[PDB]
Design a protein around this ligand. Structure first.
Ligand code: GTP
Ligand code: GDP
Ligand code: CA
Ligand code: MG
Lengths: 440, 421, 67
């Protein structure tokens, strides 16, 4: 019961999926072959971890996951890697020819050839679910597959599964680890087309994760493995609500209720702490007060913006590990007096707390330290519109001269779709102003 | 996945032969086609350029074309002659005579079908064809005329595949043939319409690098081709080794080509036979460019840098930013994040580390302006036109080819003078 | 109240079914329009190349009649 099917689209999607499922396996005590000594019920059950894992009669714990990419090399490493026995080969889906950093190729030209096959495999996972809660879709804004094929998928998943929940973990593009000049186009096109079909979307600026890895973990030049392992911890903190069950563990939908005031305004700003190296972790008992304070320091956010110059419409704290409500209430009282936390006048100013007693694991031989308690703050702030503004500005510079547009037009798209998508972003930027501004 | 190489004419077959010399050495493939290498991080993307025949043999996916049989026989007797598959040699009988019309319309059209039969045989064996690369010159007859005919013919059968090309430009310093500005202008006409990404290999730049920098009073073609082979190895490094960035011809085209006609690049290389700042400083310098154009005289639309060898990736990011920030006048403001950078741990032969530069500058107009003068100086008095009008052409084609190349110069100027607001 | 209760749940089903229907028709029209546009571009690309081949035939034939 309460099953969630994760979908991993393109590079970034798959490699974050690699990090996420590895981390979930370590948290639950699932071995690389899929065995789980803790699980006494063989073949199935209705434990909280079964929301993400189906069980076979042989005792294997198979992820409710579908990996998709238009070229094989990234998914080949899943087929070859440490957790190859974890997945059934039908879950790992590949094409030959990739989308070439083109939304048009990913959504139309190449995507149409594989979309029906992907929906067949998702249907086969959906039929195993006694009750299906919804989908978690992992992708990048910048990639051709990540933008194009995801938008096609999100459209088709709305048709086949109706109003059923669809969450996004979206990789917002950053020039430090960028792969293409046309990533602003792919970002604006996918955001436009996906906006109606997504109930909640957690954006992840690579620049923010890259800077956190450099500042906190003291890594000269962070790789994708450094970014993904950090990103997997935030995804784990967000999805720990579904995979475990204590008395204070609040469901993901119950946070959604608070985080999404209007259908279009569904982009929570995520902040996480503590991010700390094992060298430094040694003999620093990071209290509840310190990690909660870190959630309002904007260095630790996943998207680069300034909540101070903005307004909160919701603020949720997802604690995990050695935490009790007494320490949380004391920290929130301390924070309320000292910080800039300005709410909109139409929403209550309380902090929604949830605690999950299972502490956070780390991948052995990782850069990230094992800590006894941790927190992930999810906040619906108007400051996240700054992320759209930076992205829309880069669109405007190129689109004004029609730079790189022929690549999209050559694959069947029209100039109408660009200006139509951009107007929707202008409307969305205006929506974030309207919610923030004080009332009559 | 797969790239199908073609070499056309005397120039195309020589620089092609040197290209296959160098990349076979880098992948650890001897002249018998046998792998004897140390790393696997050589066989991972070997299939981009090579076919796996039985006996663990690696044969180039290469098609050798010439109307002159002499230049093709010299390739078979060279160092890596026997590595090529014998059916892929498509020789003609007549010879070019340094006539674009003979290459494009008459004598080259006689031979074009037999080339396509090998192309179609090679393309049918591919799992997923990226596209094609043609090594050739624009001054001569075969590589200039028949090379552009092959592009048009291959485009007809493969319209959704990439067609890049390595076009060698003529110069009075290197070549002595007087009709080359006609041949080049006629070839550029075709390349503007039918290629996705041209590397402009300028013989004037290669002469000047050999004479001034390398310090050679007597520069042979072997001295020129040493620079070309090093350049060709550099720009194809992301295609040939397992890399993050620009792993295929389409992704490179999507990043480097903001407008369809403006796809004529300015290749660069360093060092010319050592720290990361010095590598970065040298690769952007005007004397290291393989096209005779000063980038200070224009603006970079897009740039691609490939650093090779074991080095600090932190340092590469800083130096590529430091040249960008401190020379921001020479990058267009209206394409943000236009300079992309790739790293590869395997260096080239001999060097500890190197850097290769691919630049879509507006200053490339200087190359096309120089050809336009050498074209127009002759064309104003209808000089040497009986060579072409005898073959069946008319003065419309020359008037059109002149006007189409001058439009290209105006377009490079148009986007140079463009602005944010 | 019972009559209103049935009207509410039916209106909820109407909203879901219209959302599925509108999404299906938007996609079907987009994929069809994109198919038409991409095929039109490849049509014009080959029609250009055939005009080059027709012109190339008028060079072979023109040389034939210059003697
Ligand atoms: N955080 C993170 N970002 C990634 C990773 N891999 C790629 N990206 C980002 O994704 C963007 C490029 O898109 P990709 O996802 O690589 O492309 P794709 O979706 O495979 O699409 P095609 O390659 O065009 O088929 C860039 O902005 C990268 O920074 C990863 O492992 N982690
Ligand atoms: N860089 C370089 N240029 C060459 C070489 N061989 C010929 N060329 C140039 O190519 C032009 C003549 O073309 P060529 O290939 O000889 O005629 P074709 O055989 O009829 O195509 C002249 O401008 C030469 O400078 C070579 O090995 N290297
Ligand atoms: Ca169970
Ligand atoms: Mg990819």
């Amino acid at each position: 019961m309460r099953e969630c099917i994760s979908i991993h689209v393109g590079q970034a999607g798959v490699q974050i999926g690699n990090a996420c499922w590895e981390l979930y396996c370590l948290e639950h005590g699932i071995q690389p072959d899929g065995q789980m000594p803790s699980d006494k019920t063989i073949g199935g059950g209705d434990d909280s971890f079964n929301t993400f894992f189906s069980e076979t009669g042989a005792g294997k714990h198979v992820p409710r996951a579908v990996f998709v990419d238009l070229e094989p090399t990234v998914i080949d490493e899943v087929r070859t890697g440490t957790y190859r026995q974890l997945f059934h080969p039908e879950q790992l889906i590949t094409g030959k020819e990739d989308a070439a950093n083109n939304y048009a190729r990913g959504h139309y030209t190449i995507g149409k050839e594989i979309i029906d096959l992907v929906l067949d495999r998702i249907r086969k996972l959906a039929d195993q679910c006694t009750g299906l809660q919804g989908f978690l879709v992992f992708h990048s804004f910048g990639g051709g597959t990540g933008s194009g094929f995801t938008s096609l998928l999100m459209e088709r998943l709305s048709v086949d599964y109706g109003k059923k929940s669809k969450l996004e973990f979206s990789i917002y593009p950053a020039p430090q680890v960028s792969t293409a000049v046309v990533e602003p186009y792919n970002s604006i096109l996918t955001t436009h087309t996906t906006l109606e079909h997504s109930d909640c979307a957690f954006m992840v600026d690579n620049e923010a994760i890259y800077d956190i890895c450099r500042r906190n973990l003291d890594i000269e030049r962070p790789t994708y493995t450094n970014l993904n392992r950090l990103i997997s911890q935030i995804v784990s903190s967000i999805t720990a609500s579904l995979r475990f069950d204590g008395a204070l563990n609040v469901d993901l939908t119950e946070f959604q209720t608070n985080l999404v005031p209007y259908p279009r305004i569904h982009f929570p700003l995520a902040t996480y702490a503590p991010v700390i190296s094992a060298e430094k972790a040694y003999h620093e008992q990071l209290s509840v007060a310190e990690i909660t304070n870190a959630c309002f320091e904007p260095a630790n956010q996943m998207v680069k913006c300034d909540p101070r110059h903005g307004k909160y419409m919701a603020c949720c704290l997802l604690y995990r590990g050695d935490v009790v409500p007494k320490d949380v209430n004391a920290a929130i009282a301390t924070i309320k007096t000292k910080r800039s936390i300005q709410f909109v006048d139409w929403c209550p100013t309380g902090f929604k707390v949830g605690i999950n007693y299972q502490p956070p694991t780390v991948v052995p031989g990782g850069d990230l330290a094992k800590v006894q308690r941790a927190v992930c703050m999810l906040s619906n702030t108007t400051a996240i519109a700054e992320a759209w503004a930076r992205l829309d500005h880069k669109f405007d510079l190129m689109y004004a001269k029609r730079a790189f547009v022929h690549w999209y037009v050559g694959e069947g798209m029209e100039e109408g779709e660009f200006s139509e998508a951009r107007e929707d972003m202008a409307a969305l930027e205006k929506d974030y102003e309207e919610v923030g501004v004080d009332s009559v | 996945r797969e790239i199908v190489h073609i070499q056309a004419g005397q120039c195309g077959n020589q620089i092609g032969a040197k290209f296959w010399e160098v990349i076979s050495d880098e992948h650890g493939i001897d002249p018998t086609g046998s792998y004897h290498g140390d790393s696997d991080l050589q066989l991972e993307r070997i299939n981009v350029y090579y076919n796996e025949a039985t006996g663990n043999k690696y044969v180039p996916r290469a098609i050798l074309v010439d109307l002159e049989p002499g230049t093709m026989d010299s390739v078979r007797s060279g160092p890596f002659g026997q590595i090529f598959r014998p059916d892929n040699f498509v020789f003609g009988q007549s010879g070019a005579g340094n006539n674009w019309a003979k290459g494009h319309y008459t004598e080259g059209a006689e031979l074009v079908d037999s080339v396509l039969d090998v192309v179609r045989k090679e393309s049918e064996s591919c799992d997923c064809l990226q596209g094609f690369q043609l090594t050739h010159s624009l001054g001569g007859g075969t590589g200039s005329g028949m090379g552009t005919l092959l592009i048009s013919k291959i485009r007809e059968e493969y319209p959704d595949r990439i067609m890049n090309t390595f076009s060698v430009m003529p110069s009075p310093k290197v070549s002595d043939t007087v009709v080359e500005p006609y041949n080049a202008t006629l070839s550029v006409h075709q390349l503007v319409e039918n290629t996705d990404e041209t590397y402009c290999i300028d013989n004037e730049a290669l002469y000047d690098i050999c004479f001034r920098t390398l310090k050679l009073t007597t520069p042979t073609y072997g001295d020129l081709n040493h620079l070309v082979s090093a350049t060709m190895s550099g720009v194809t490094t992301c295609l040939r080794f397992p890399g993050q960035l620009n792993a295929d011809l389409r992704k490179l085209a999507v990043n480097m080509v903001p407008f369809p006609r403006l796809h004529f690049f300015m290749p660069g290389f360093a060092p010319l036979t050592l720290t990361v700042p010095e590598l970065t400083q040298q690769m952007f310098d005007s004397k290291n460019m393989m096209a005779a154009c000063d980038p200070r005289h224009g603006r970079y639309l897009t740039v691609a840098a490939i650093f090779r060898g074991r080095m600090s990736m932190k340092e590469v990011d800083e130096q590529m930013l430091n040249v960008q920030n401190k020379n921001s006048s020479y990058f267009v403001e209206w394409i943000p994040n236009n300079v992309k950078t790739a790293v590869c741990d395997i260096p080239p032969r001999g060097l500890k580390m190197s850097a290769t530069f691919i630049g879509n500058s507006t200053a490339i107009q200087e190359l096309f302006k120089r050809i336009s003068e050498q074209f127009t100086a002759m064309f104003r008095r209808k000089a040497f036109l009986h060579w072409y009008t005898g073959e069946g052409m008319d003065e419309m084609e020359f008037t059109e080819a002149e006007s189409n190349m001058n439009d290209l110069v105006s377009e490079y100027q148009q986007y140079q003078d463009a602005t944010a607001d | 109240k019972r009559e209103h209760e049935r009207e509410v749940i039916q209106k909820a089903i109407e909203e879901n079914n219209n959302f599925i229907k509108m999404a299906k028709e938007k996609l079907a029209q987009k994929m069809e329009s994109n198919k038409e546009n991409r095929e039109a571009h490849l049509a014009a690309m080959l029609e250009r190349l055939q005009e080059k081949d027709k012109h190339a035939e008028e060079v072979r034939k023109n040389k034939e009649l210059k003697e």
